[PDB]
Amino acid sequence: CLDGKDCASFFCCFEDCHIRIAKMDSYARIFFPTAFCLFNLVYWVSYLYLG
Amino acid sequence: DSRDYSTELSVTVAVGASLLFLNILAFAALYYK
Amino acid sequence: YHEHYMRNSRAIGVLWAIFTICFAIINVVVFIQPYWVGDSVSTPKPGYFGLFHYCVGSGLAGRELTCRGSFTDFSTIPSSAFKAAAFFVLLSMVLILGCITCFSLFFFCNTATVYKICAWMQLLAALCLVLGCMIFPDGWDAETIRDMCGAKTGKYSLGDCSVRWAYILAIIGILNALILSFLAFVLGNRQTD
Ligand SMILES: CCCCCCCC/C=C\CCCCCCCC(=O)O[C@H](COC(=O)CCCCCCCCCCCCCCC)COP(=O)(O)OC[C@@H](O)CO
Ligand SMILES: CC(C)CCC[C@@H](C)[C@H]1CC[C@H]2[C@@H]3CC=C4C[C@@H](O)CC[C@]4(C)[C@H]3CC[C@]12C
Ligand SMILES: [Cl-]
């Protein structure tokens, strides 16, 4: 907090954020495939190479 | 097998030091107004 | 000035993402590899044990390392402290992979918002890793670890066994997670400028 703001204002997001919920589908369309790809990568590499 | 841990510890701390040096380089670059 | 500022911010953001992937790789490596603590010259038997998996020796001029332990079977884990440490490391891994997902949100969501979201989750992952590495020492008093190392071993007492590369790598992961999270906090605040 060296910039000279409150701890919460420096840290958290109590300025706008909820409101932007209509874009949940747009977020999910790329969020969910990325999560599944990551899970597949870590699962398969752990169970095949490192395990 | 020679149950000694010198090379492994050395490379481990070397890689850790390199990563931390890059991180502090980024921090110093950000704090260089 | 503005073009240089924007280019520097983008470059540091890309570097921060690269080191975030590196920290996720470190978390996966330390969780999977069972090389937290290991034998020494004076140990009764050779071997090495991580969060849940352990491979003690047989004890007859031989290798004979019996690898038993699996996080998927909590019974095989020697100690409740080991169980808790594995759980906390897993939660930290879940959080950091959560950020490897949330990098996708940069397309649509506000850059400051996404940066803050991973700044907080990286802080939480660092806290979980600290808790795991602080509670893992409590488990050496268990009978299996006592047989592995010796009578000198105890709670927060190595005895004769020696920390191998995974434990110190975990410590580097903790402090790198902390500095990366702070970098994320300030980067998110810097987007608004
Ligand atoms: C092995 C592990 C593999 C894991 C896979 C990791 C990959 C995960 C999946 C997708 C990543 C998608 C990243 C997309 C980044 C593109 C970011 C971008 O679009 O450009 C701008 C800059 O953003 C930014 O500086 C943020 C920078 C993005 C940093 C995160 C991406 C990291 C990619 C590095 C990958 C290296 C892999 C190598 C590993 C060995 C933001 O746009 P914009 O102004 O219009 O928005 C403002 C708002 O008002 C509307 O969006
Ligand atoms: C949804 C996204 C953000 C996170 C996904 C986390 C994934 C990668 C996690 C969740 C549970 C994890 C598994 C939990 C238990 C074990 C058993 C252990 O002996 C090897 C690792 C392994 C097999 C883990 C691999 C990684 C894993 C599959
Ligand atoms: Cl397992």
Q: Least CA distance to B2: which residue of chain C? A: C41
The residue among C90, C26, C15, C100 whose CA lies nearest residue A38 is: C100
Between positions 28 and 47 of C, the ones with CB within 8 A of A are 28-29, 32-33
| Cα A30 off chain centre by | 12
Helix (H, G, I), strand (E, B) or coil at C67: strand
**Pair type for strands C54-56 and C66-68:** antiparallel
The pair of three-digit structure tokens given for residue A31, joined into one six-digit string: 């969020």
Q: What is the resolution of this structure in A?
A: 3.5
Helix (H, G, I), strand (E, B) or coil at C1: coil
Give A3→chain C minimum CA distance, Å.
9
* CA gap C96, C85 in Å, rounded: 17
Residue A31, chain C, CB below 8 Å: the answer is yes
* Number of helices and strands in chain A (H, E): 2, 0
Residue C182, chain A, CB below 8 Å: the answer is no
Residue A51, chain C, CB below 8 Å: the answer is yes
* CA gap A41, C74 in Å, rounded: 24
Method used experimentally: cryo-EM
Tell me the residues surrounding ligand 3 (ion) with CB < 5 Å.
C 70-72
